[PDB]
């Protein structure tokens, strides 16, 4: 056996490959990207969960050196690791937009990203427009969306309405999207979703030097400090162009601002696996940040 079977899962489908026994992360990754027709690769990674902490396939380490569950077939999930500051300008390819659309929609439906009720209905309408094409009362009669996962449970429970009260609302918006192709409807979804507050934010529980539990936020704009009860609005921000360095040692992070008069910010994070993910996310988001502006 010169190869082992790798199962790749995207938001769209699952597929399989033969991974060479000594292939590194970049080898498998490049193969998955060519197969998809995806040239905008900087956004994506290959993910697997072990002990409930997310890990990303390191490009220059052997796939089999990773501690992924090696129960056949070895499985990874193709997912956006980074988000653009503007989807409509940075996502050139249709495959890229479509994968982003599905990953973000899932986030909003699983309530990992907060969405207000009225925007949730508008979001659903573009999703419906994307899946069914133009509205047609002949084909799409009352009840055609009864089995569809369209709204977050929160919005459904917020104001108790029957599915057919929500269908009317989503259908009413649906009818006004007439003429929009799948790719257009999907980009309109992203344009709304990306202005949501929790969009593109990686959250991590941390503690300041006084022992106060807090949330570190890592996104396309920079590092952020949140209160654990408020994931919508960060109390402190450090934009990528305003950080001189980020230091790490023995579970302690030290953010050093560019402004020499601003005091450093220190925090603790207990897990080594999370600390390297944080550092990774820092390097990546900073790189994409500085490239949009080069």
């Amino acid at each position: 056996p010169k190869t082992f079977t790798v199962r790749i899962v995207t938001m769209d489908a699952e597929m399989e490959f033969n991974c060479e026994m000594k292939w590194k992360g970049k080898d498998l990754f490049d193969l998955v990207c060519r197969t998809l027709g995806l040239r905008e690769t900087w956004f994506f990674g290959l993910q697997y969960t072990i002990k409930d902490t997310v890990a990303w396939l390191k490009m220059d380490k052997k796939v089999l050196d990773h501690d992924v569950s090696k129960e056949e077939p070895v499985t990874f999930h193709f997912l956006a690791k980074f988000y653009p500051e503007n989807a409509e300008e940075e996502l050139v390819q249709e495959i890229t937009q479509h994968l982003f659309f599905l990953q973000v929609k899932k986030q909003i439906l699983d309530e990992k990203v907060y969405c207000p009720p009225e925007a949730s209905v508008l979001l659903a309408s573009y999703a419906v427009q994307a899946k069914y094409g133009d509205y047609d009362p002949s084909v799409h009669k009352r009840g055609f969306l009864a089995q569809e996962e369209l709204l977050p449970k929160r919005v459904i429970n917020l104001y108790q309405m029957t599915p057919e009260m929500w269908e009317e609302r989503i259908t009413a918006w649906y009818a006004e999207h007439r003429g929009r192709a799948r790719d257009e409807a999907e980009m309109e979804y992203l344009k709304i979703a990306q202005d949501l507050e929790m969009y593109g934010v990686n959250y991590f529980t941390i503690r300041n030097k006084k022992g106060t539990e807090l949330l570190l936020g890592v996104d396309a704009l920079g590092l952020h400090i949140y209160d654990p009860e408020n994931r919508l609005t960060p109390k402190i921000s450090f934009p990528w162009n305003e950080i001189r360095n980020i230091s790490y040692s023995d579970k302690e992070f030290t953010i050093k601002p560019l402004d020499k008069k601003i005091d450093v910010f220190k925090f603790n994070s207990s897990k080594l696996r999370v600390n390297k993910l944080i550092l990774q996310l820092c390097i990546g988001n900073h790189d994409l940040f500085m490239r949009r502006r080069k």
Partner: peptide, 15 residues
């Protein structure tokens, strides 16, 4: 548009 990761215990220099 670049970064440099360096041991000492690691320091992430951002430009």
């Amino acid at each position: 548009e670049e970064v440099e990761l360096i041991l000492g215990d690691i320091i992430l220099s951002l430009n």
